[PDB]
From a paper:
We recently found that Ile86, located near Glu76 and Asp105 in the three-dimensional (3D) structure, is important for the PcyA catalytic reaction. Although Ile86 is not a catalytic residue, its mutation to aspartic acid (I86D) disrupts the proton relay to BV. Thus, the reaction stops, and in I86D, similar to D105N, (an) electron(s) is/(are) donated to BV. During research to elucidate the reaction mechanism of PcyA, we also found that the I86D–BV complex exhibits a unique absorption spectrum with a sharp, high absorption peak around 730 nm. This peak is present as a shoulder peak in the WT PcyA–BV complex (hereafter referred to as the “WT–BV complex”), disappearing in the D105N–BV complex. Neutron structures elucidated that BV in the D105N mutant is in a neutral state, whereas that in the I86D mutant is dominantly in a protonated state. Glu76 and His88 showed different hydrogen bonding with surrounding residues compared with WT PcyA, further explaining why D105N and I86D have much lower activities for phycocyanobilin synthesis than the WT PcyA. The neutron structures of PcyA D105N–BV and I86D–BV at room temperature were refined to 2.10 Å and 2.00 Å resolutions, respectively. The R-factor and free R-factor for the D105N–BV structures were 16.51% and 18.00%, respectively, while those for the I86D–BV structures were 17.25% and 20.82%, respectively.
Numbering used by the authors: 5 to 247
């Protein structure tokens, strides 16, 4: 399932989304993957109420270091495209949370967000991450976006932009590839932590999922195609499940 060649959505998504989906899949392809079963063994889902149809493709995996690796592609009607990805770490290893959300319409990408988010109580990334991320240097983008109020969960390296041209699209993709290369290497060298530290990282992941559920822009997309009760179950059990 991890080849995207069987995807029905891929050919119709915004090109930046296609490039990022491919890069994520390439990063995961040779890991010690096992399937992760979403609620009701959800793969493909389509729904419509009174407006536009929402189509969603889900792929989910797990490894010893990552309890849940979720790649979701979505399209609303013919306008709105979305790529959503979260690698949820196993708290035992103390790794940060990789996440990204890319939203596009007919006139281009409106929102591109990626981060390696902290799970420590002091809201800092592990020292090895800080060092590696600082060495990449700060990227220059013309149109930055300020994080909403629930976005206190994001690191100081969080990127949130509207890409202004294809060069910036490519620059953002390359920065996400760099984040993934750092993250995959740190996962090899990570050691199992003490019970007390595992608990702190668990709490940090819970908090991340609770704050992400406050994103009303995501919720309203789901609500308009499936209704309020479906949307709440999807947000809380599929996208941002509390462990
Ligand atoms: C069904 C799945 C799914 C859909 C439909 C979705 C849609 C979605 N996500 C966002 C913004 C959107 N997404 C995020 C961030 C994230 N969101 C995440 O799922 C993750 C992992 C991050 C961060 C790593 C932020 C911070 C914002 C801006 C929220 C705002 O402007 O209020 C928008 C508003 C775009 C804009 O303002 O230009 C939409 C429609 N996101 C999804 O995940």
């Amino acid at each position: 399932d991890l080849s995207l060649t069987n995807s029905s959505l891929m050919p119709t998504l915004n090109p930046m989304i296609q490039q990022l989906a491919l890069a994520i899949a390439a990063s995961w392809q040779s890991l010690p993957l096992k399937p992760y079963q979403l609620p009701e063994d959800l793969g493909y889902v389509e729904g419509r109420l009174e407006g536009e149809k929402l189509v969603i493709e889900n792929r989910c995996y797990q490894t010893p270091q990552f309890r849940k690796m979720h790649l979701e592609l979505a399209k609303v009607g013919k306008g709105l495209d979305d790529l959503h990805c979260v690698m949820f770490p196993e708290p035992l290893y103390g790794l940060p949370l990789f996440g990204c959300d890319i939203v596009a319409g007919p006139g281009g990408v409106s929102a591109a967000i990626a981060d390696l988010s902290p799970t420590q109580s002091d809201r800092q990334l592990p020292a090895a991450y800080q060092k590696s991320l600082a060495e990449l240097g700060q990227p220059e983008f013309e149109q930055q976006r300020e994080l909403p109020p629930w976005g206190e969960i994001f690191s100081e390296y969080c990127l949130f932009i509207r890409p202004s041209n294809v060069t910036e699209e490519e620059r953002f993709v390359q920065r996400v590839v760099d984040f993934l290369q750092i993250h995959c290497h740190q996962s090899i060298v990570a050691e199992p932590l003490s019970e007390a530290q595992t608990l702190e990282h668990r709490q940090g992941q819970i908090h991340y999922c609770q704050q992400q559920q406050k994103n009303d822009k995501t919720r309203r997309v789901l609500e308009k195609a499936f209704g309020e009760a479906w949307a709440e179950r999807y947000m809380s059990q599929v996208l941002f499940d509390v462990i």
